[PDB]
From Swiss-Prot:
The chain crosses the membrane at residues 7-26, 32-49, 66-82, 93-118, 125-150, 154-179, 191-222, 227-249, 253-266, 274-307, 313-342, 349-376, 381-411, 576-604, 605-632, 641-663, 666-692. The gene is SLC9C1. A 1,2-diacylglycero-3-phosphate binds at residue 3. Residues 666-727 are annotated as: S4 segment of voltage sensor domain. Homodimer; the dimerization is stabilized in the presence of phosphatidic acids. It comes from the Eukaryota. Optimum pH is 6.5. This is Sperm-specific sodium:proton exchanger. Residues 838-920 are annotated as: cNMP-binding domain. GO terms for molecular function: cAMP binding; cGMP binding; potassium:proton antiporter activity; protein homodimerization activity; sodium:proton antiporter activity. A motif (Essential for sodium:proton exchange) lies at residues 167-168. 3',5'-cyclic GMP binds at residues 895-897, 905-906. Electroneutral sodium:proton antiporter that regulates intracellular pH of sperm along with capacitation and fertility. Activated in response to egg-derived chemoattractants, couples membrane voltage to sodium:proton exchange and transduces membrane hyperpolarization to cytoplasmic alkalization to cAMP signaling and ultimately to sperm motility.
Length: 1047
């Protein structure tokens, strides 16, 4: 009917035009957005002549400014923020801010002066500043897209993107400031009044955004199965942050959304992964809709209202303006180049050109132009604002956006590095080989013999998109160095693919490897990695100081009252419900404190101020009973704590002012100010624990990243060290490489072991978090394995896989600090004790806790193996000639092999810190071995623990070249078991059911050749059968792993 929404046809039609442009002009260098402007112009000219069409474009063309800003800008700004690589953005935050904020001011002011002097429009400074503001809002989406692939992607790409984000955010702020001075002027403004205005837009805005962000991520972390709720919460937070910010709080909405976008982006872990991928594609779609509409709207109104008021001179000014804003941006970048070069990633002269040429203008500039074109009404200023802004957008998108592709070439930035070319060629060649095998396999199929292979081969063709002498010695060294660093990069990627590394640690390690590859004679330096696990000094100090404030040890020392009258209260005094009730009462006291006092201020409603006085009586009564109960429970010791004395002062205030108030204006203001100022501050007692939790969280986030980088490096080095043994020939080179790897590994394992001592609880939290995450991951795999085998139905598989998903989400809410378990708990958790309560009691009764000081030697080489140590606290350094060094920390048990083979100790143990060890004597272990002999025998368990640790190096060395990482090998061995040579004193291999057989201890004879095999050897696949000697000196033990099919 006549009331039908006519914006539906325009909005939907805009989508179709966007699709058409985006499709047809996909290959041409001209960006599609230019075509949208042409189509908008066509709609404008045709609309002016055909009244029917005008009825459909009017509602959206002639659209109120506020509705333009309130709906579109939050989408554009949030989407831009939500799409950033925050981690890189933060690491270059200063460099972006200097160039964005200060650069924006100078760029706009210089443009403003140009507009005033050059143009004959006779604009004043306010209008010229609006012009400069809308002329300095960039939109480099087309340029960062190219930089994403070709080169210089990591640093340059995000710097231009972040700079554009911040200058867009600030340009709107400047535009808002100067628009009110032009279209909504005010009679007067004081200096102090303006300063408060600055604080609101510049300081309060970001704080409002930060508060809403931290509230949002809190709830998102507590939504477990509703994806729709997560998406809706994101939408509502984004729009309410802007609306409440601009309209109710009058703080800067755009900056609030910028901060909200960045915080929510950083806290992506709080969003379920499946939702995360949705949101990225969702906000992209919303931003794409916003761009398509704004460009078509400009195309419409520019022809209907703007081009009718354009003189020949205006065209001349547009060219001069385009040249000016281009050289101005370059001047700003160069001028700050000395500063920017000394922070973050310094700008090379070629990078500067990219930033200068890549400063495309776009939607935000146009959107703000439409506001002026609307507010100005019939004034020419509106038309000429829209004309120039549209002109600059067209010129930049025609000239800059098309030639940037060639400029990146001329500057020699698009070249693909040799490593990438080689990797792509190898991958393509392997794929090409993979298809030939598949193609042959199909040709043998009876049901596909008649298929047209000429077409099949042509269709499935993947094509490469990119198409002793010192001089001798140094050459191999450079070759080896690069062949090593390349291996590491692989080992990091393998770890990530198997969920062993967080993405951030992977990025750091790969970045360091790449940097080392570019430099000369450079390997990975741990000194560069240290920045990952160095805790900033502020946080430990804050944690210590805050924990001192609520120490309250002087209350814990208070004894029970000496008579029954106080005994009952004392119990209440230590019930959490008491403190919770008092806190709730206090926080409820805000309602009177605000309502009555603000009402009295307004009067300065008498019945309200008369009535609320009674609530003061009620809260006084509550606090009085609280004080009475506390004094009765504690007695004279009550006054000891400083927190209590503050409450005594508060009650003194209550008595004094409630009496005096009931009994000039000074008394009333005294009552109000004193009640408000004091009674709210006693919440800090309950607040401080939350601050401690926040601090823990900040430390945990840093320490966790440290462990990943440190542990990622160690595993990478361990894997590589068994590869270079066969990747390089020259022994001298080989020896030099491994020496560096070990001197790096020792530093990492030491420093990373000292952090645990500095922050015990946080370390335990981090580690238990890793433990759970690993368990769930491999728990997820079995579900896929069961699903893939068809052994479990798809719907049932999904039902299980949900419980894993919610479980992995609840990790993020786990406490940042777990109190370290006491020593007795460690014994309970030793690998070869778990579950055997009878054995645990036997050991716990005979384990003697010892304490050592720095530098003491627990055991020395050649000493008889008198027992084994479990390190419950500290860090010990092992230095054994069978040269070979290591550092062991909490949990690790020393001497497991010694008590079994009864052979002298292999390494000297020195304490790097104050160490505590549970010492179990060899005699006790022998007794335990003799007295605990069920199927999972203690001797069997001990050997199994040792066996795997001995086996893992052998299997790695034998199959490092293949695709298995360490975790896979260790799990692989986990399926194994030790054979009882008493059940059969000879072992017969079965190649179809035994995957690997390892000899751990004792000599074994080849049954046919009667060759003797040394103890730690990995039995070669060629051996058919083994015969074992029987001597007391070395009883032979053997480890085997069967195929999945149980024998």
């Amino acid at each position: 009917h006549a009331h039908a929404p006519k914006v539906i046809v325009f909005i939907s039609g805009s989508c179709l035009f966007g699709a058409i442009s985006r499709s047809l002009f996909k290959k041409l260098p001209i960006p599609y957005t230019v075509v949208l402007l042409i189509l908008g112009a066509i709609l404008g000219v045709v609309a002016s002549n055909v009244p029917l069409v005008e009825e459909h474009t009017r509602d959206v063309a002639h659209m109120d400014p506020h509705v333009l800003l309130q709906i579109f800008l939050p989408v554009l700004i949030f989407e831009s923020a939500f799409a950033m690589d925050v981690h890189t953005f933060m690491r270059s935050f200063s460099q972006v801010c200097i160039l964005a904020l200060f650069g924006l001011v100078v760029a706009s002011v210089l443009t403003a002066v140009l507009a005033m002097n050059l143009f004959n429009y006779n604009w004043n400074f306010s209008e010229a500043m609006m012009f400069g503001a809308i002329m300095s809002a960039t939109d480099p989406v087309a340029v960062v897209a190219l930089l994403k692939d070709l080169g210089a992607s990591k640093q340059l790409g995000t710097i231009i993107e972040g700079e554009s984000l911040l200058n867009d955010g600030c340009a709107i702020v400047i535009f808002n400031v100067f628009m009110k001075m032009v279209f909504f002027p005010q009679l007067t403004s004081t200096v102090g009044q303006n300063v408060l205005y600055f604080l609101q837009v510049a300081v309060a805005g970001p704080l409002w955004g930060y508060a809403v962000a931290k509230v949002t991520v809190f709830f998102l972390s507590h939504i477990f199965n509703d994806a729709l709720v997560e998406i809706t919460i994101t939408l509502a937070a984004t729009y309410l942050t802007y609306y409440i910010g601009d309209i109710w709080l009058e703080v800067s909405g755009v900056l609030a959304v910028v901060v909200l976008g960045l915080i929510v982006n950083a806290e992506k872990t709080s969003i379920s992964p499946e939702v995360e991928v949705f949101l990225h594609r969702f906000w992209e779609m919303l931003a794409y809709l916003a761009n398509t509409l704004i460009f078509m709207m400009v195309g419409v109104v520019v022809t209907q209202k703007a081009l009718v008021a354009v003189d020949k001179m205006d065209w001349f000014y547009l060219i001069i303006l385009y040249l000016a804003i281009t050289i101005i941006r370059g001047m700003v970048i160069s001028l700050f180049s000395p500063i920017l070069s000394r922070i973050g990633y310094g700008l090379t002269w070629r990078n500067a050109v990219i930033m200068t040429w890549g400063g495309l203008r776009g939607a935000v500039g146009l959107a703000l132009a439409l506001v002026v074109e609307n507010l100005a009404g019939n004034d020419v200023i509106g038309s000429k604002f829209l004309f120039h802004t549209a002109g600059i957008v067209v010129l930049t998108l025609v000239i800059n956006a098309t030639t940037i592709q060639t400029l990146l070439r001329i500057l020699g930035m698009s070249d693909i590095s040799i490593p990438k070319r080689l990797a792509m060629a190898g991958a393509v060649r392997r794929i090409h080989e993979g298809q030939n095998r598949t193609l042959n396999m199909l040709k043998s199929d009876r049901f596909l013999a008649d298929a047209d292979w000429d077409i099949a081969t042509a269709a499935c063709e993947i094509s490469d998109p990119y198409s002793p002498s010192p001089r001798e010695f140094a050459d191999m060294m450079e070759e080896a160095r690069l062949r090593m660093l390349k291996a590491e990069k692989i080992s990091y990627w393998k770890q990530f693919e198997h969920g062993m590394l967080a993405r951030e640690a992977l990025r750091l390690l790969v970045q360091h490897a790449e940097v080392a590859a570019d430099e000369k004679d450079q390997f990975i330096l741990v000194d560069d990695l240290k920045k990952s696990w160095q805790i900033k000094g502020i946080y430990p100090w804050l944690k210590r100081k805050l924990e001192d404030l609520i120490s309250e040890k002087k209350i814990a020392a208070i004894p029970m009252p000496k008579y029954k009258l106080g005994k009952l209260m004392y119990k209440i005094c230590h019930h959490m419900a008491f403190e919770v009730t008092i806190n709730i009462a206090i926080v409820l006291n805000i309602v009177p404190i605000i309502m009555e006092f603000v009402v009295q201020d307004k009067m300065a409603s008498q019945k309200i101020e008369d009535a609320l006085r009674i609530s003061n009586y009620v809260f006084f009564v509550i606090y009085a009973i609280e004080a009475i109960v506390k004094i009765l429970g504690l007695g004279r010791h009550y006054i000891v704590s400083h927190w209590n004395k503050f409450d005594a002062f508060i009650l003194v205030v209550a008595l004094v002012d409630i009496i005096i108030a009931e009994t000039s204006s000074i008394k009333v203001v005294k009552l109000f100010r004193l009640l408000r100022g004091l009674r709210m501050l006693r919440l800090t007692k309950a607040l401080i624990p939350k601050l401690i939790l926040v601090v823990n969280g900040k430390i945990n986030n840093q320490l966790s990243l440290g462990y990943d980088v440190g542990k990622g490096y160690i595993i990478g080095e361990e894997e590589v060290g068994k590869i270079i043994d066969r990747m390089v020939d020259n022994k001298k080179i080989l020896r030099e490489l491994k020496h560096i790897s070990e001197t790096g590994r020792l530093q990492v394992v030491k420093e990373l072991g000292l952090l645990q001592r500095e922050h015990p609880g946080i370390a335990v939290s981090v580690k238990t978090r890793q433990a759970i995450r690993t368990i769930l991951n491999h728990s997820r795999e079995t579900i896929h394995e069961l699903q893939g085998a068809g052994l479990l139905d798809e719907m049932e598989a999904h039902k299980l896989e949900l419980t894993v998903e919610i479980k992995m989400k609840r990790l993020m809410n786990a406490p940042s600090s777990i109190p370290p378990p006491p020593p007795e708990n460690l014994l309970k958790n030793v690998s070869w004790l778990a579950g055997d309560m009878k054995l645990i009691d036997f050991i716990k009764a005979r384990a003697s806790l010892l304490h050592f000081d720095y530098g003491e030697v627990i055991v020395r080489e050649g000493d008889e193996s008198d027992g084994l140590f479990l390190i419950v606290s500290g860090l010990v350094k092992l230095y054994g000639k069978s040269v070979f060094e290591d550092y062991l920390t909490v949990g690790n048990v020393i001497g497991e092999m010694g008590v079994l083979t009864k052979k002298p100790r292999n390494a000297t143990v020195t304490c790097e810190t104050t160490v505590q060890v549970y010492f179990i004597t060899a005699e006790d272990m022998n007794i335990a071995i003799d007295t605990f002999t069920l199927y999972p025998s203690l001797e069997y368990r001990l050997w199994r623990v040792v066996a795997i640790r001995i086996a893992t190096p052998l299997i790695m060395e034998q199959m490092a070249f293949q695709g298995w990482t360490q975790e896979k090998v260790k799990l692989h061995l986990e399926r194994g078991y030790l054979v009882d040579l008493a059940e059969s004193h000879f072992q017969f291999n079965i190649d179809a059911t035994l995957e690997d057989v390892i000899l751990i201890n004792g000599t074994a004879y080849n049954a046919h050749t009667r060759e003797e095999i040394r103890s730690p050897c990995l039995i070669s696949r060629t051996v058919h059968k083994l015969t074992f000697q029987y001597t007391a000196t070395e009883e032979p033990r053997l480890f085997v792993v069967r195929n999945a099919e149980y024998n």
